[PDB]
Design a binder for these strands. Sequence first.
RNA 1: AGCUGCGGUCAUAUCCACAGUAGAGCACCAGAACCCGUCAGAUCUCUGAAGUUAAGCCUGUGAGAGCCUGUGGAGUACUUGGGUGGGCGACCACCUGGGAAAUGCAGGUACUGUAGCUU
RNA 2: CAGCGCGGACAGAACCCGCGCGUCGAGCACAAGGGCAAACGCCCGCCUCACGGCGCCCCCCCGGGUGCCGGCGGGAAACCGGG
RNA 3: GCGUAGAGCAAUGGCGCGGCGUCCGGCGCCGGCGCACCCCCAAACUGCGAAGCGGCAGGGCGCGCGCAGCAGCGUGCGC
Lengths: 63, 258, 160, 168, 209
Amino acid sequence: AKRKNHTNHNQNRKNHRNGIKKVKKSAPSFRGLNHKYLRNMLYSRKYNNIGRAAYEAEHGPQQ
Amino acid sequence: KIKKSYFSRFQTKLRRRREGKTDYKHRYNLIRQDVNKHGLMKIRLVVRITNSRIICEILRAHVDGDRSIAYADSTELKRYGITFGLKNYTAAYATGLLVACRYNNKIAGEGPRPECYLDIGLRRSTRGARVFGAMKGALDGGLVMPHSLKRVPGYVSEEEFDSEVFRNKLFGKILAGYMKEMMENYPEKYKKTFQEYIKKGINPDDLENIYENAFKKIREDPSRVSKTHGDYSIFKEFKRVRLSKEERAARSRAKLLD
Amino acid sequence: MRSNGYRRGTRHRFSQAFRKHGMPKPSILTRVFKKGQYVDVVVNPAIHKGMPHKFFHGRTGKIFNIDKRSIGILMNKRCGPRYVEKMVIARVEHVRPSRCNEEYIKRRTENDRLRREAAARGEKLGSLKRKPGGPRGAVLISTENNTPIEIRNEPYFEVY
Amino acid sequence: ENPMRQIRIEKLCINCCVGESGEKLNRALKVLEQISGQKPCTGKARLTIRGFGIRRNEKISAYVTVRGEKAREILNNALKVKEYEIKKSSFSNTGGFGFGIDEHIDLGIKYDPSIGIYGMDFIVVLSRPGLRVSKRRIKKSRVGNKQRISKEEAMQWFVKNYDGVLLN
Amino acid sequence: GRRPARCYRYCKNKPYPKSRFCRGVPDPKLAIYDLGRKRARVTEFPLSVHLVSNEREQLSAEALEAARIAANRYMIKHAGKDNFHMRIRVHPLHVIRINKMLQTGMRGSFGKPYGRVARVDFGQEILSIRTKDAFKAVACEALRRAKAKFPGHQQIKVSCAFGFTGISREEFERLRKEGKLISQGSHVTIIKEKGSIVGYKEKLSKAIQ
RNA sequence: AGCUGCGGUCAUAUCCACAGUAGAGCACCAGAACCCGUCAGAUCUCUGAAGUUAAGCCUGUGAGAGCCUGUGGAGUACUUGGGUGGGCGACCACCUGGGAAAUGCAGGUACUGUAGCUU
RNA sequence: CAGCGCGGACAGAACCCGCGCGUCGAGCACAAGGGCAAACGCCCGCCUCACGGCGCCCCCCCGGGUGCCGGCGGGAAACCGGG
RNA sequence: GCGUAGAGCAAUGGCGCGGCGUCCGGCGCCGGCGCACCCCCAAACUGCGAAGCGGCAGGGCGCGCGCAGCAGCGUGCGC
Ligand SMILES: [Mg+2]
Ligand SMILES: [Mg+2]
Ligand SMILES: [Mg+2]
Ligand SMILES: [Mg+2]
Ligand SMILES: [Mg+2]
Ligand SMILES: [Mg+2]
Ligand SMILES: [Mg+2]
Ligand SMILES: [Mg+2]
Ligand SMILES: [Mg+2]
Ligand SMILES: [Mg+2]
Ligand SMILES: [Mg+2]
Ligand SMILES: [Mg+2]
């Protein structure tokens, strides 16, 4: 039978009972980053305290 | 007639477009940098041709306006012997050669060099255009621009470029041959059309050596000669001054009475 | 009940201002953008590519990613009882560098400088809180050359 | 007075709207080849008109533009047809004038019955030196009011330059 | 067959004019908005009396015609057909709807165009008569015969303005003597010092006096 | 001081009308063998410097149109919040805050970065 | 561009051409809205980014956006193109 | 960031009369058209625009050194 279609009544009151929780803090993610930038940042992290020329002097051609 | 609502709703274009001086669609695509680079605005070789001279500038965009990095004019070619034909193809080449040797003698060679880009502006990009002669002059002076030689004379393919048929355009051998045959067949028409050539004493057979000698002297000493031009507040009296508001009212009330 | 296209109900939101139509000026290309910087998404409707959703047209978010022609922006949205972080990809024509923390950065760099300089000379500054507007000050208004003026109720008259 | 304000023939535009395609048009654009010495342009009909028998995009007319001193000999030959006499109202608001001759063989052309007979509209455009500021690509601007030609300054030019006689 | 005007009295809906979305609405029976000597000059009828709505409601186009005829017949019979110019101010622009429902009831309830009404506010003039000063009492009486045709409360006001211009009679008389007025028939333009002076002297050329 | 190249603001810059501008610049302009492009060397392209500041450009003028700024309209219109205020209603009044717009009126008609050039 | 103006044999209300103006009133397949003037419209040339492989975002999908590595087209180039 | 109330007829779309005219038609008048003022207007109109709301910020910064295949002279990331 024909009845009520829609309301937003009591929705703000419901949504504030457990509050509007924030975005939950996380570790920083590489999701959404530029791929050329992210590839280069990991290369800088891979050869952080030892340079690349010294790293490939040890481990050979690293690619 | 045109209604008053026309003028009130009229949105004027940008002032350099109303002046007909910049192509703002072309300008937008030219100075656009990737957002990954953030500050490194690209340098562009802007070549402008006037009726008198040929302007070549290396310049970079800022927020307040473009900042000039290097400048050369074809009027600066008088030091190198070229006083004749200041807007021909060879003056375009030599002025493009001049910024390229100025900009390289300005910066020192410890780091890598940035790429420059050619800015024609509103000239037409035709084969044999002078604006690409200034491009070809800049590449010969060592300015790195991502060109292709399709519009400079001497082009047959992307791998093959004929330097010899480029050189007769460059060293005026096309021009001198036209200048020589006019002198023989129509000596009075030669007298009228090349007046500043004769007063400079230039001869068409001599013309290749003047250009070849100029190209060495540019690459040897491209350094800028400076002119101080200290005071010009003498010229301040040449401008007119505006009236005041009550003087404008005094002429208006007088115009009502007569 | 309205249809749910990507630009629904944007007749005024995605319009141009009066006598401010046209393609964007090249001066926007000289704006720097950095990761962590806050930006205001305000859509340039002359630029049709890289347009964000209409929901983010008033919103301000922090940049997480910087691309060739575009920018990734972190913007929280209410989904019921939670804020959900959306990743908004927008062309630079649709954003402005936000002045949300404009006066905080001006306050911070000066105060951190003053704390560094005072620590250099062996002093220290206790607290540089922004003091709010307190009570009113005591006033002295002299009636010398300022005589009090009577305000009276006046008879109602009507003009027609 | 000043030599730069002097009025010249800027261009002469000729067209013969023969009204229909086929051989009569292709002979008509041969006539403009004879007169101008240039390759003419064909005109397309903008709409399909039942009353005239034309169709949209149908080649309907033939037109050309001649300049220089070559435009002057075409003009004075065409003015010899009309006794150098042109109505005052035939001068345009913007400095030009026009007239139309009924047969092209009044220009010093033998008949050639394989070609035929065509009339044509001669449209004269006048200018002072400095029209380039409105026609060039870069820094395009309007030509000033002193350098624009009026109808009467075109009328004064027509009586002075061609020994003209105005009418009405 | 027409509904009573109590069904469409108040401004209940948003204004709903004849547009490309609401077509098929019939023409209003209020055909004439200017009566008397319309062509009379601005300086011939100084007096102005107005019938002013004391209601926020919708005047029917039928009542707007009935009050038109009631006021026009009285000004003709008493002031005469040349001694007045009566203007109807409000225009029946709002279209009222009728549902008209086999009997569908409230299914598909949005109504077809039924009539036209004029939407008036508090203090809005409905009618206005410009006359000579001798026919004040005639024009006050013709408007009270007009407001009988109208719902709710109306008020007859004698305005200090000169005729159908907004300028008051003291202020209109001064500028007419100064030469600062150019007639536009029922209303007038005040000559200001804003033009070019050659255009200003052409403005004094076309002034009233 | 100015001009010019490249700009930034994008009408205080637009639009109409009339004036004036020494220098240099910008131009107009002379020409078409070439490169190049056209129906047309008009544009574009090349080459030139004989002429000319007539135009453009510039500047000034106008009780100019517009535009800009201020002011005013006006604590008006409207409104958040409040009352067991009022009114048959329509809706209105009050309290507490917030607070416009159009017309009007007055003034303004550009500023600026960088580079080069001009006595 | 729409449109307007003024000129021009046949030629007319309506054939074509020219000049002047023309803030977008035109056009952009279509509904409407937004957008757009050396263009996002018109014309011409060369083309087939209406592409493969990996991601990510807006996000039920649909559709679109954005990257990376290849493969290309146009252009002197910057650039633009993932219908 | 919004575009509601108000306000506005300035563009779009309506409403209505006068006024003006080296405009057109008809026989000075009448009708068209044009222009300027004006009138009544708009949920699917806007040169303006509230009250009211929405987003975000009010904490880390400064310096130095390393790293990168990114970049071409920076940006990130480590310390
Ligand atoms: Mg281009
Ligand atoms: Mg697309
Ligand atoms: Mg009953
Ligand atoms: Mg209702
Ligand atoms: Mg003014
Ligand atoms: Mg209560
Ligand atoms: Mg002025
Ligand atoms: Mg359109
Ligand atoms: Mg689609
Ligand atoms: Mg796509
Ligand atoms: Mg509204
Ligand atoms: Mg309203």
